Scaffold this active site. Structure first.
Site, PDB file in Angstrom:
ATOM      1  N   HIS A 218      37.626  33.474  43.942  1.00  0.00           N
ATOM      2  CA  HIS A 218      38.289  34.393  44.869  1.00  0.00           C
ATOM      3  C   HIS A 218      38.846  35.619  44.136  1.00  0.00           C
ATOM      4  CE1 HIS A 218      40.500  35.186  48.725  1.00  0.00           C
ATOM      5  NE2 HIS A 218      41.211  35.923  47.893  1.00  0.00           N
ATOM      6  N   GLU A 219      39.602  35.377  43.071  1.00  0.00           N
ATOM      7  CA  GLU A 219      40.198  36.456  42.284  1.00  0.00           C
ATOM      8  C   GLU A 219      39.127  37.225  41.519  1.00  0.00           C
ATOM      9  OE1 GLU A 219      43.545  37.077  42.782  1.00  0.00           O
ATOM     10  OE2 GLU A 219      43.407  35.355  44.135  1.00  0.00           O
TER      11      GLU A 219
ATOM     12  N   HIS B 130      37.797  40.044  43.476  1.00  0.00           N
ATOM     13  CA  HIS B 130      38.686  41.224  43.377  1.00  0.00           C
ATOM     14  C   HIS B 130      38.445  42.027  42.099  1.00  0.00           C
ATOM     15  CE1 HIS B 130      40.965  40.492  46.960  1.00  0.00           C
ATOM     16  NE2 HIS B 130      41.538  39.389  46.512  1.00  0.00           N
TER      17      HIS B 130
HETATM   18 ZN   LIG Z   1      42.981  37.611  47.503  1.00  0.00          ZN
END
Ligand SMILES: [Zn+2]
Ligand SMILES: CC(=O)N[C@H]1[C@H](O[C@@H]2[C@H](O[C@]3(C(=O)O)C[C@H](O)[C@@H](NC(C)=O)[C@H]([C@H](O)[C@H](O)CO)O3)[C@@H](O)[C@H](O[C@H]3[C@H](O)[C@@H](O)[C@H](O)O[C@@H]3CO)O[C@@H]2CO)O[C@H](CO)[C@H](O)[C@@H]1O[C@@H]1O[C@H](CO)[C@H](O)[C@H](O[C@]2(C(=O)O)C[C@H](O)[C@@H](NC(C)=O)[C@H]([C@H](O)[C@H](O)CO)O2)[C@H]1O
Length: 1280
Positions: free
Chosen positions: A233-234, A237
């Site tokens: 998830h990170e 980013h």
């Molecule tokens: Zn997030």
């Protein structure tokens, strides 16, 4: 190609290579250093808390929170050298988990190869600059004599430990200070070093409650999340940042006015796109266009900027090497001058891959990790995972969901009711929440229990403005998605591009200032003093006392609040009985009457004739949640009839739209002929308005209305838990007081009926979720979209009178050419409305794959033992306790036995419920019926039972009668049309005798309905002049009216199309389920190792295989048959001849049970309770010196034996056959296994088993002697 993950201990010495002393970006110039470790190319790990921009007191736990979900604080995390080694070892395992799947391998590769641009918007145009803390960090390198040396290094990602909050991970690009402002190169297209704050042990928890699919044995349950997906998830980013595409505007802000409203942080578009699924449509399509266009300008600027570079501050850096890398990264072309330019087709693909390709939901599916489906799903308190470095809890190929512990099935490794060794609760010292008081008696409520309702000013109004059309205005793409499968495919085809050495000149230019940490600490709770009873009092009134004492139920909410022992309820028949103490009667009737009253009360359903859309209404919502209208006491149904579904919403939204500004035309010039493209543009941009406004309404509904309907379900689940828990405590006190002789015996039957409560509360939540889901839909499709249609029609009529005043103005250029007189008649398109699609845009009316996907309205698939619909209209699928799973054609299949509990119900989505009535439809599925015995044809041959049907009355059905297969239509009037298929008498070649076969049933209304089996037409019947068909809401998969208790069936790939398929389309559909990867046995199931099989040659199916003797050859003999004239059945008897076992040639620890094509294998014959090897002896006897005679259990001292075989599938894809390739010692092909007629020694003439390369020159034959059936013993076939 494969990505490498380094190993180390924290104690390992500094080595100026993979272990260094780093001066991190926000410690630039200060000579502060930290030990850091190179996990892989361009990624460093620093085992330290993220303290940048903070004060020491920020790390302590506060009293309360200002915003958001609960937060865990602990200043002592990651303090000691043991803690740091624990951190380092754990991150290495998590990177290994990611690498071990191709989807994670692909993600890591994009991150590594997306190097930041050496420079930004405020650097020199002609120059690559590495002197900036936005792209480089300093390090310290020691000699033998302690002589230090300042150096620097380029990188992409640096991972630290957590900030003050352990369970809230963060990703941030480096900030630059420019004219007293914050500048982010990760938002301008350049990218930068990204810094992560990550904690692997402390994880979020979620639940099962809202979901469409439900199993009665799973129930509802909380799950915790896999840290590897949290890491991924990170990492998404980071990926956005490195391509400089981080998104900071267009945040969704929560409303904070009312008490029931949730006080969260503002939701960024970044997080919605990263999470994925339906909640990415919170950002409207027009906003997605502004973002696309911004990055396109940004990348154009960079193309021009890169074209002008001729030097660098570093002497060693080869400039042309970096330019090729940046042309690769940014997807630039060159023009004829040699300057870099933006190819927009290539940009569109790149842009979509980065924003909309990798999501949490899609990575979840590829990794078999469970996720929530909505961004607004409920979060509970976080838990911790102390034993990530224990392979019995968590490993680097399956995480928690380990198959060898029966924890893969149904994500049970993540389930908190099952896998209790994997997690521990966090201690309350460090856990803080946002609470609010409700005083009337004060009660405290968690912020997590409140409802998110979006501010109205956070949604766009750009589609209500004046758009000016011209000759040269382009189209908006309306296409913002990218397949993760497409990313993996392209990743495998990539040529291995290599990065430059990442050491560079010392860094001095940056400024060592992190942005100040923004505290979430609060001193007090917000307290609200109120007059009336809200929903929260009604729920608090249902709470049982935490003490074994006498308890009762009352219909007064105020009684239950004040009185400790008393509990609120909304079930009158249940209140009567539980208060009554049964004196002098047995518990049988006492307890049963508690249960089957709760059943009758909780199972209530009804419909409201005025509301067509909502198939299921549960009347007891109002009394349980205080949802009632003035002058309607105990009359919820009356309130719904008058007000509609909006009664259910606590906040009533403003659903009006303003005037949509009509289009204008500014292209006056008719200097050039055929300037009719200006007319096309105008009509295109008119079509775009309808889609823009439709999607804006959908966005507002998701953030403002659907969230309310979601919380109703959660609220109803809490009350049903409270009610059930009260009863389970009521029943225990009367059991303890009971002093009767039967007491000791009846104990198990008492506890048996307490589980029966859970079973009926679960059945109630199925009703309730249908109710809230369909109501929410109804409110969108009717109330909200009508307001859009009103203003969209006004928008049209106005915009035609601009269009035709422009056609009239330039009327002399288009006449006398069939253009003007054509283009009054073209405005039939303008008279037609553009319809709204809630879920999937379906087109029931040349590419066969696309026709099939586009027309599919239901499609059952089983993944990790969960049956669900993957069509696009997420229909509810209910799986009952004794529906079973068996091997299927590609995965697993539904299996049905003959009892009440063996059932699967598909409640059709409201978008498809009347598609049967007048229109064409095809039904297709795989079927497996066992061979009916002689006895069972005599007993049951008359008995017809249905296996799949949609009948109320009217509808369709599939049914079996003896060895006959029956399709049945039936209209509203009563008229019945049918097809009956008589199965073949030769049961070895029969379609209903224990093999997997593919059924397809097309229905044309103005013609006939046809039955196909394996793409071949078997029956037909005339449908013309049949009335309109009115089905049941559900489609049931069950044995119905079947007298044979031993009867069972298997069903796979159940599917419904909204047209009648032609035979070319059925051929493609049939063959699309048939892969070459896994091999198959005679019955159609996956072939397996260490399993006994009889071989039959496909070319001579009447023969069995025999052995002359041990240490000798095999040959063919005839097989006994069974015949039965009166029943009209016959077959060759199975299970005669030699038994064969397949084993792995090179055994490994972790492999599947399944035999894949291309596997290298040994073959043994099982004779006299002993396993003897099959093979060819060196220079052994052979017919014509080429067809090589096989031997079983051959052993001579000097002579070697060739035994290496390859299991393969070279021909005849529709048949469940296998070929077998024999090799020598040095991977030279000795031939495929088959037979050859001849005479060894003085024996008789025999078809002797051989290996020969002759077969390779006849693989196109219809029938060939190297094809083998592998037949295991099966319960569904025994010889009569
Ligand atoms: Zn997030
Ligand atoms: C017909 C025969 O005996 N074939 C056996 C073969 O014999 C050699 C010659 O055969 C060819 C061929 O493959 O057709 C002729 C080609 O021109 C050659 N091609 C080249 C050089 O490019 C080719 C190659 O030499 C070999 O394939 C090796 O690579 O061989 C054959 O014509 C010749 O026959 C005469 C010869 O003309 C004269 O000198 C003299 O009259 O005597 C000989 C002997 O008869 O002899 C050659 C041998 O030196 O040799 C191969 C060795 O690999 C096989 O033994 C082949 O027999 C076939 O073997 C396979 C696997 O073991 C099966 O057993 C075949 O049986 C089946 C089948 O298809 O499974 C059984 C069926 O029941 C049967 N059906 C019917 C109705 O009878 C069929 C059928 O006979 C057809 O042959 C199918 O196409 O066969 C078995 O035939």
């Amino acid at each position: 190609m494969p990505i490498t993950i380094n190993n180390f201990r924290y104690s390992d010495p500094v080595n100026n290579d993979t272990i260094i002393m780093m001066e991190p970006p926000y410690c630039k110039g200060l000579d502060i250093y930290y030990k850091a470790f190179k996990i892989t190319d361009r990624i460093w790990i620093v085992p330290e808390r993220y303290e940048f921009g903070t004060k020491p007191e920020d790390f302590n736990p506060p009293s309360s929170l200002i915003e958001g979900a609960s937060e865990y604080y602990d200043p002592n995390y990651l303090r000691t050298d043991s803690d740091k080694d624990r951190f380092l070892q754990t991150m290495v395992k998590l990177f290994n988990r990611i690498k071990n799947n191709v989807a994670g391998e692909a993600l890591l590769d994009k991150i590594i190869n997306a190097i930041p641009y050496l420079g930004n918007s405020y650097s020199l145009l002609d120059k690559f600059d590495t002197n900036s803390n936005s792209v480089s960090f300093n390090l310290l390198e020691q000699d033998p004599s302690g002589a230090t040396t300042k150096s620097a290094m380029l990188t992409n990602l640096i991972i630290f430990g957590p900030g003050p909050v352990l369970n809230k991970n963060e990703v941030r690009g480096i900030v630059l200070r420019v004219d007293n402002k914050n500048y982010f190169p990760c938002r301008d297209g350049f990218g930068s070093i990204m810094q992560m704050a990550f904690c692997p042990e402390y994880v979020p928890t979620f639940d099962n409650v809202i979901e469409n699919i439900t199993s009665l044995t799973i129930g509802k349950s909380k799950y915790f999340q896999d840290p590897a997906l949290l890491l991924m998830h990170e990492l998404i980013h980071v990926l956005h940042g490195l391509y400089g595409m981080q998104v900071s505007s267009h945040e969704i802000i929560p409303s904070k006015q009312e008490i029931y409203m949730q006080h969260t942080y503002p939701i960024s578009a970044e997080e919605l796109f990263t999470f994925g699924g339906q909640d990415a449509n919170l950002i409207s399509i027009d906003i997605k266009n502004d973002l696309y266009e911004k990055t396109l300008n940004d990348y154009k600027a960079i193309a021009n900027k890169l074209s002008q570079v001729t030097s660098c501050n570093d002497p060693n850096i080869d400039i042309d090497s970096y330019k090729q890398i940046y042309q690769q990264k940014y997807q630039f072309d060159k023009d004829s001058n040699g300057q870099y330019i933006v190819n927009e087709d290539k940009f569109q693909i790149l842009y979509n891959s980065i924003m909309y390709g990798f999501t949490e939901i899609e990575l979840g599916k590829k990794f078999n990790i469970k996720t929530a489906l909505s961004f607004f799903s409920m979060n509970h308190d976080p838990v911790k995972i102390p034993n990530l470095l224990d392979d019995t809890i968590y490993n680097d190929t399956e995480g928690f969901n380990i198959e060898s512990k029966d924890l893969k099935s149904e994500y049970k490794g993540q389930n908190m009711r099952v896998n209790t060794n994997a997690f521990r609760n966090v201690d309350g010292s460090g856990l803080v929440s946002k609470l609010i008081g409700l005083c009337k008696l004060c009660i405290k409520i968690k912020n997590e229990d409140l409802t998110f309702i979006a501010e109205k000013n956070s949604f766009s109004e750009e589609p209500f403005q004046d758009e000016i059309v011209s000759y040269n205005t382009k189209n908006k793409p309306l296409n913002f998605n990218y397949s993760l499968d497409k990313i993996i495919v392209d990743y495998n085809l990539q040529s291995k591009i290599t990065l430059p050495n990442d050491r560079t000149t010392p860094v001095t230019k940056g400024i060592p200032y992190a942005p100040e940490y923004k505290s979430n600490a609060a001193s007090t709770i917000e307290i609200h003093n109120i007059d009336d009873n809200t929903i929260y009092q009604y729920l608090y009134a249902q709470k049982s006392p935490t003490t074994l004492q006498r308890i009762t139920m009352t219909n007064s909410v105020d009684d239950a609040l004040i009185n400790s022992t008393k509990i609120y309820s909304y079930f009158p028949s249940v209140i009567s009985k539980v208060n009554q103490g049964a004196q002098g009667i047995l518990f049988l009737q006492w307890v049963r009457d508690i249960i089957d009253d709760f059943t009758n009360e909780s199972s209530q359903k009804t419909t409201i004739d005025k509301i067509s859309d909502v198939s299921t209404i549960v009347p007891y919502i109002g009394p349980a949640l205080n949802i009632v209208k003035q002058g309607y006491e105990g009359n919820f149904i009356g309130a719904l009839e008058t007000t509609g579904v909006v009664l259910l919403l606590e906040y009533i939204p403003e659903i009006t739209l303003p005037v949509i500004a009509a289009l204008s035309i500014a292209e006056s010039s008719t200097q050039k002929e055929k300037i009719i493209k200006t007319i096309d543009n105008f009509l295109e941009k008119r079509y775009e308005k309808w889609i823009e406004v439709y999607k804006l309404v959908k966005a507002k509904w998701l953030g403002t209305v659907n969230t309310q309907f979601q919380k109703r379900s959660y609220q109803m689940y809490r009350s049903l838990e409270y009610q059930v828990d009260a009863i389970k405590k009521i029943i225990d006190y009367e059991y303890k007081i009971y002093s009767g002789p039967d007491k000791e015996q009846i104990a198990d039957e008492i506890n048996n009926l307490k589980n029966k409560l859970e079973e009926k509360a679960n059945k109630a939540m199925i009703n309730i979720n249908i109710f809230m889901r369909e109501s929410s839909r109804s409110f969108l499709v009717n109330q909200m979209i009508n307001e859009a249609k009103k203003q969209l029609l006004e928008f049209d009529t106005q915009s035609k009178n601009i269009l035709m005043q422009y056609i009239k103005a330039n009327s002399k250029f288009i006449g006398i050419t069939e253009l003007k007189k054509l283009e009054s008649k073209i405005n039939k398109v303008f008279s037609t409305p553009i319809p709204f699609s809630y879920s999937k845009n379906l087109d029931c009316w040349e590419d066969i794959d696309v026709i099939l996907k586009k027309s599919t309205i239901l499609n059952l698939d089983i993944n990790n033992d969960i049956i669900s619909d993957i069509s696009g209209f997420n229909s509810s699928v209910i799986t009952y306790p004794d529906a079973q799973l068996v091997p299927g054609i590609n995965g697993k299949a539904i299996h049905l036995v003959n009892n009440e509990s063996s059932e699967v119900i598909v409640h059709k989505a409201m978008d498809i419920e009347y598609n049967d009535m007048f229109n064409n439809f095809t039904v297709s599925f795989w079927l497996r019926v066992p061979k009916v015995s002689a006895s069972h044809l005599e007993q049951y041959g008359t008995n017809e039972y249905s296996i799949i049907s949609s009948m109320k009355g009217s509808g369709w059905s599939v049914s079996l009668k003896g060895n006959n297969l029956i399709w049945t239509l039936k209209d509203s009037a009563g008229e019945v049309r049918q097809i009956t298929f008589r199965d073949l008498p030769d049961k070895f070649n029969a379609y209903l005798a224990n093999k997997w076969v593919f059924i397809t049933i097309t229905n044309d209304r103005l013609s006939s309905a046809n039955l196909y089996i394996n793409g071949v037409l078997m029956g037909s019947a005339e449908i013309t002049g049949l009335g309109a068909i009115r089905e049941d809401n559900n489609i049931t998969l069950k044995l119905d009216r079947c007298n044979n208790n031993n009867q069972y069936v298997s069903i796979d790939k159940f599917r419904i199309f909204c047209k009648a398929l032609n035979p070319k389309e059925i051929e493609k559909l049939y063959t699309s389920y048939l892969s070459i990867t896994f091999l198959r046995d005679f019955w159609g199931n996956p072939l397996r190792y260490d399993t006994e099989y009889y071989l039959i040659p496909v070319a001579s199916s009447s023969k069995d295989v025999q052995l002359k003797n041990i240490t000798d050859y095999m040959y063919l003999t005839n097989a006994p048959s069974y015949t039965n004239g009166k029943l009209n059945i016959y077959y060759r008897r199975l299970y005669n001849g030699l038994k064969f076992i397949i084993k792995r040639y090179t055994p490994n620890n972790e492999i599947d049970s399944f035999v894949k094509s291309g596997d290298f294998i040994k073959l043994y014959v099982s004779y006299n309770n002993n396993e003897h090897i099959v093979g060819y002896p060196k220079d052994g006897n052979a017919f014509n010196n080429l067809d090589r005679i096989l031997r079983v259990g051959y052993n001579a001292p000097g002579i070697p034996l060739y035994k290496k075989m390859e299991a393969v599938k070279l021909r005849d894809l529709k048949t469940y056959s296998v070929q077998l390739k024999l090799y020598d010692d040095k991977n030279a092909s000795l031939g495929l296994v088959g037979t050859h007629n001849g005479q060894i020694g003085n024996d008789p003439n025999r078809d002797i088993l051989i290996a020969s390369n002759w077969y390779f020159n006849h693989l196109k034959d219809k029938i060939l002697g190297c094809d083998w059936y592998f037949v295991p013993t099966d319960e569904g076939w025994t010889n009569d």
